[PDB]
């Protein structure tokens, strides 16, 4: 056997009191009235999750797999990757990253304190001198907010090494994980695209097929499906880069000591068990998942004899668009695809279904939809079911949180009916009332943390989505119906209320002048009776280059 996890009986413990409900009394009640619908996961459901993620992996590799792997390595062998200096790696550490057990924290790392850098150097030397000893990790239950569904999701489990080790991962591997995936997978590497670019790729791919069929593939507990073999195959791809000798060794040692597995320690310092699958909180998780998903999926496409496939991969998230052969034979091919993924260790959660309308394909929890701009031209844009974004926004209104998913959701889904009507109106109202428009806030974009001034949103949205994001109307019936239904479920006030609120915050923003007034003019033009003509506004290099989920990255 090869078990994803072995358990001792020690509990997955919280490090502090955990909240699972919105506070009693108002705050987010003006956002949504059905507060009992909103919950946050805690350590109290850790054991339900442990049951789902724990199983034996039988893996059977074939010629298709080996062929694809060799192709990927040929492309990987064009890459030259550089060691990051200590200073560069320290600057990529988020200011609230989990402190080291060696008596320094994220702020000390970022300041290059004596104790921090002493430890980081000792850890680096230790990777070079010790090639075997498993590296300790901490296991914790993740706190995430959802809406109930007619019951409740258990907490996800996060597994991560000590801050000192995380700084060493950046030095050995940041350049690799930021450059290799695109070198290997080209246009298939989803993290290279902004939302507009993603939409474009999907639409152009779909229109390029004589008769398109598409499907999303959901692997059940992907991280747990990843084998020790997969993780060594992943290293085999990394080792094709030109690398400094210390980087080669650090990659070698990290692979055997950390990435393939190791001991799990709870917040109380007790041994909880042992992992032999992917850790969610290491630098290589997004890259590793993306490579492994792509490899397995490309080989399965061949085994299924699916014709003219174009794939788009974002970590464990997969969508394929191919040439239809007919209904019955697409169904059969998709079953063979699944059978081969299952042999490769990646069985499905939701059984995949062939889809003949691009708009009904959900990938990265998002779908393509269509609206029209001021002049009436069709504009394709990315949207999703707003339930989770709105539940999270109510939580962040009522309780202090370091990550502001509302701000990330505005950036990624600015064109949508729901982000504009609700999230912009609600959060600009609070910010303006609290006199904090100017204050920068943390949010996440493809797993990395960015500090963003709310007043820069008009500029950010134009660059990313186009001027069109401020003028979209004539949304599709499908999208409208989903929005309305979600908003009934959560008890969100009607359009009239948001329109009034938006007119009011728009008035106050305009009177302040400057970036505030720009926010009023562009973000809230939908709210006014007599629309204004909107025009172009007088460094996003690192944005939408790569994914870093769990990889402890800041900018
Ligand atoms: C300016 O012209 P619009 O009025 N045009 C439209 N409005 N809608 C629209 C607006 C709100 C809701 C809705 C349903 C619901 N149900 C509950 C329970 C609660 C709440 N709040 N809602 N809201 C449903 C449809 C669609 C269109 C269109 O052009 O296709 C408009 C309003 C806002 C925004 C951000 C953008 C536009 C273009």
Swiss-Prot record:
Occurrences of domain RdRp catalytic (ranges): 212-330
Chain positions recorded as Mg(2+) 2 binding sites: 218, 316-317
Cellular localization per UniProt: Host cytoplasm; Host endoplasmic reticulum membrane
Reactions catalysed: RNA(n) + a ribonucleoside 5'-triphosphate = RNA(n+1) + diphosphate
Post-translational modification (record): The N-terminus is phosphorylated by host PRK2/PKN2.
Membrane disposition: Single-pass type IV membrane protein
Cofactor binding note from Swiss-Prot or TrEMBL: Binds 2 magnesium ion that constitute a dinuclear catalytic metal center.
Cofactor section: Mg(2+)
Record text on activity regulation: Activity is up-regulated by PRK2/PKN2-mediated phosphorylation.
Residue numbers of Phosphoserine PTMs: 30, 43
Assembly with partners or alone: Homooligomer. Interacts with non-structural protein 5A. Interacts with host VAPB. Interacts with host PRK2/PKN2. Interacts with host HNRNPA1 and SEPT6; these interactions facilitate viral replication. Part of the replication complex composed of NS2, NS3, NS4A, NS4B, NS5A and the RNA-directed RNA polymerase.
Functional summary from the UniProt entry: RNA-dependent RNA polymerase that performs primer-template recognition and RNA synthesis during viral replication. Initiates RNA transcription/replication at a flavin adenine dinucleotide (FAD), resulting in a 5'- FAD cap on viral RNAs. In this way, recognition of viral 5' RNA by host pattern recognition receptors can be bypassed, thereby evading activation of antiviral pathways.
Protein name: RNA-directed RNA polymerase
Organism: Hepatitis C virus genotype 1b (strain HC-J4)
Shown chain mapped onto the complete sequence: 2420 to 2981 of 3010
């Amino acid at each position: 056997s090869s078990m994803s996890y072995t358990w001792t009986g020690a509990l997955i413990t919280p490090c502090a009191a955990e909240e699972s409900k919105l506070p009693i009394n108002p705050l987010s009640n003006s956002l949504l009235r059905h507060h009992n619908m909103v919950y946050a996961t805690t350590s109290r459901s850790a054991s339900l999750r442990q049951k789902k993620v724990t199983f034996d992996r039988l893996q059977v590799l074939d010629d298709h797999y080996r062929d694809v792997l060799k192709e990927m390595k040929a492309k990987a062998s064009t890459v030259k990757a550089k060691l990051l200096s200590i200073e560069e790696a320290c600057k990529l550490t988020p200011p609230h990253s989990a402190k080291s057990k060696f008596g320094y924290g994220a702020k000390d790392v970022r300041n290059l304190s004596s104790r921090a850098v002493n430890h980081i150097r000792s850890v680096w030397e230790d990777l070079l001198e010790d090639t075997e000893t498993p590296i300790d990790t901490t296991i914790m239950a993740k706190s995430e907010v959802f809406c109930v569904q007619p019951g409740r999701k258990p907490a996800r489990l996060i597994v991560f090494p000590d801050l000192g080790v995380r700084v060493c991962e950046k030095m050995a591997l940041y350049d690799v994980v930021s450059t290799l995936p695109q070198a290997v997978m080209g246009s298939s590497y989803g993290f290279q695209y902004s939302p507009k670019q993603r939409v474009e790729f999907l639409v152009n791919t779909w229109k390029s097929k004589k008769c398109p069929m598409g499907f999303s593939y959901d692997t059940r507990c992907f991280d747990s499906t990843v084998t020790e073999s997969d993780i060594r195959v992943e290293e085999s791809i990394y080792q094709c880069c030109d690398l400094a000798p210390e980087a080669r060794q650090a990659i070698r040692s990290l692979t055997e000591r950390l990435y393939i597995g190791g001991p799990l320690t709870n917040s109380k310092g007790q041994n909880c068990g042992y992992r032999r699958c992917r850790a969610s909180g290491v630098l290589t998780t997004s890259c590793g998942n993306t490579l492994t998903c792509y490899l397995k999926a490309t080989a399965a496409c061949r085994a299924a004899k699916l014709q003219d496939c174009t794939m788009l991969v974002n970590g464990d998230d997969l969508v394929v668009i191919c040439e239809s052969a007919g209904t019955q034979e697409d169904a059969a091919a998709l079953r063979a695809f699944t059978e081969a993924m299952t042999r490769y260790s990646a069985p499905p959660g939701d059984p995949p279904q062939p889809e003949y309308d691009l708009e009904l394909i959900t990938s990265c929890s998002s779908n393509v939809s269509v609206a029209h701009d001021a002049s009436g031209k069709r504009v394709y844009y990315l949207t999703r079911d707003p339930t989770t974004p709105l539940a999270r926004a109510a939580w962040e209104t009522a309780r202090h949180t370091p990550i502001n998913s509302w701000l990330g959701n505005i950036i990624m889904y600015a064109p949508t009916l729901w982000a504009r009507m609700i999230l912009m109106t609600h959060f600009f109202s609070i910010l303006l009332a609290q006199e904090q428009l100017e204050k920068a806030l943390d949010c996440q974009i493809y797993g990395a943390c960015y500090s963003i001034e709310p007043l820069d949103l008009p500029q950010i949205i134009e660059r990313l989505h186009g001027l069109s994001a401020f003028t979209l109307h004539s949304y599709s019936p499908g999208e409208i119906n989903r929005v309305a239904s979600c908003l009934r479920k959560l008890g969100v006030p009607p359009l009239r209320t948001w329109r009034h609120r938006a007119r009011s915050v728009r008035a106050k923003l305009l009177s302040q002048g400057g970036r505030a007034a720009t926010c009023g003019r562009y973000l809230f033009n939908w709210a006014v009776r007599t629309k204004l003509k909107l025009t172009p506004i007088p460094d996003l290099s690192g944005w939408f280059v790569a994914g870093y989920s769990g990889g402890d990255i800041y900018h």
